[PDB]
């Protein structure tokens, strides 16, 4: 599960009920595929700035 390949999540991974559940840091929104994390603004956390 979360130990295979981070469960295919971009960020946080939890193994709730024998299943994988992804989530993200503050300032991101979980993609519609429930795995990817989308930045909510111009300078999301953890991203190097290459304006």
């Amino acid at each position: 599960l979360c130990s295979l390949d981070n469960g295919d999540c971009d960020q946080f991974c939890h193994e709730e009920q024998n299943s994988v559940v992804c989530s993200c840091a503050r300032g991101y929104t979980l993609a519609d595929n429930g795995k990817a994390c989308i930045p909510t603004g111009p300078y999301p956390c953890g991203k190097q700035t290459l304006e």
Partner: protein, 234 residues
């Protein structure tokens, strides 16, 4: 930073610098959000009044993206004990918000379990700052970054002349001359996961710098996530 590399434009945007009234940097910090800076608790002893500077990469000039910020509140850890270097963590609330731009952006705070299980299991970590370039040298003028391998808890507990508490961890090399140093303290230790950087540690201490058989000691951020949260909320 000893034997590191220069942080290139926009590479280490979460890096903050504590400067004294003389405008000299003496410790590092990590931008957590628009209002909060994460730093080492022991840094609050090397000055009576300090400010925070972000967007800086060369103390030699002024690129523009730089911004100095006055401190509104400083939240030092209640159980921090000078003698043992235990609980080496503090949070600073800025009087005015930091405006993110090139070379100025926050680092992500991770989730404890995931971090320790996935982030701290990674091979390398990244530490940065304007600290010495050699053990007996002067503070650095250019912001530098170093890739530091996570060190095995037992081999690290064994290499250290002092107790490695549960609130600390080791990183760096045994013989290789690369390691944080004086001035980098309070600075960011970050782990990259899929091009996203998460705060995993705070430059704390070490016996000298890049000494053979000695490693770099960092505050274990993942152990203070709950505390950092409460600190940033009040």
């Amino acid at each position: 930073i000893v034997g590191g590399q220069e942080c290139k434009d926009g590479e280490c945007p979460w890096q903050a610098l504590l400067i004294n009234e003389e405008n000299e940097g003496f410790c590092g910090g990590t931008i957590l959000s628009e209002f909060y800076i994460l730093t080492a608790a022991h840094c609050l002893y090397q000055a009576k009044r300090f400010k925070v500077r972000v967007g800086d990469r060369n103390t030699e000039q002024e690129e523009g993206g730089e911004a100095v910020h006055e401190v509104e509140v400083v939240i030092k850890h209640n159980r921090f004990t000078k003698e043992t270097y235990d609980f080496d963590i503090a949070v600073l609330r800025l009087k005015t918000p930091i405006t993110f731009r090139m070379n100025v952006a926050p680092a992500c705070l991770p989730e404890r379990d995931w971090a320790e299980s996935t982030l701290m299991t990674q091979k390398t970590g990244i530490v940065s700052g304007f600290g010495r370039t050699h053990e007996k040298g002067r503070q650095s003028t250019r912001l530098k970054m170093l890739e530091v391998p996570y060190v095995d808890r037992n081999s690290c507990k064994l290499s250290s002349s002092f107790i490695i508490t549960q609130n600390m961890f080791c990183a760096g090399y045994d013989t290789k001359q690369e390691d944080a140093c004086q001035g980098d303290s309070g600075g960011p230790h970050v782990t990259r996961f899929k091009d996203t950087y998460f705060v995993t540690g705070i430059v704390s201490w070490g016996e000298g710098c890049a000494r053979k058989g000695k490693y770099g000691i960092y505050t274990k951020v993942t152990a203070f996530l709950k505390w950092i949260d409460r600190s940033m909320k009040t």
